[model samples]
Target: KVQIINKKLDLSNVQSKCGSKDNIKHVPGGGSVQIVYKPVDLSKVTSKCGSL
Candidate 1:
């Protein structure tokens, strides 16, 4: 997803940097990688016990 020296780097490096390993697709012929980053939603969190 990143470009360096006129070449595209793999998705592993991008995932490490962004802390995301969700959707990663490698293009044929070493063209490029498709990466999708989805943020965590806190509204869905639930607690069995009472409030903190």
Candidate 2:
């Protein structure tokens, strides 16, 4: 089920924040590959991929 939570966050003038573009590579044909960066809080992600 999808639920909505009421919370206010500052969303003014947000910009794209990237670590580096060095990982991006161009393929021979016509496409390009990019490495995405994600900063995670260990406490939040550990529970999601926990072992049985």
Candidate 3:
């Protein structure tokens, strides 16, 4: 699946800069996206916000 700014990155266990395992509040998407919390990295990922 693809989107304007929402997408699953291509980095396996990336460690760019995510402020030490921050609890990411899942954004708006399909019903299959409901993990409220994850070790989500900020290297190449930035939710559906306007910036990264």
Which lDDT tens digits does candidate 3 get at residues 1-52?
4224435667545444334444555667646655553456544545568655
Instruction: In angstroms, give how far residue 51 of model 3 lies from its true place.
Output: 63
Q: TM-score, each model?
A: 0.19, 0.24, 0.16
Tens-place lDDT digits, model 2, residues 1-52:
5444544554333334454434646678867566666654332222347477
**How displaced is residue 40 in candidate 2, in Å?**
0.9
Residue clash pairs of candidate 2: none
**Which regions in candidate 3 have their CA more than 4 angstroms from the true location?**
1-19, 34-52
True-structure RMSD, every candidate = 13.9, 13.6, 17.5
Best candidate (score: TM-score): 2
How many clashes show up in model 2? 0
lDDT value, residue 7 of candidate 3: 53
Q: Cα lDDT of all candidates, in order?
A: 0.48, 0.48, 0.50
Model 3 weakest 10-residue run by lDDT: 13-22
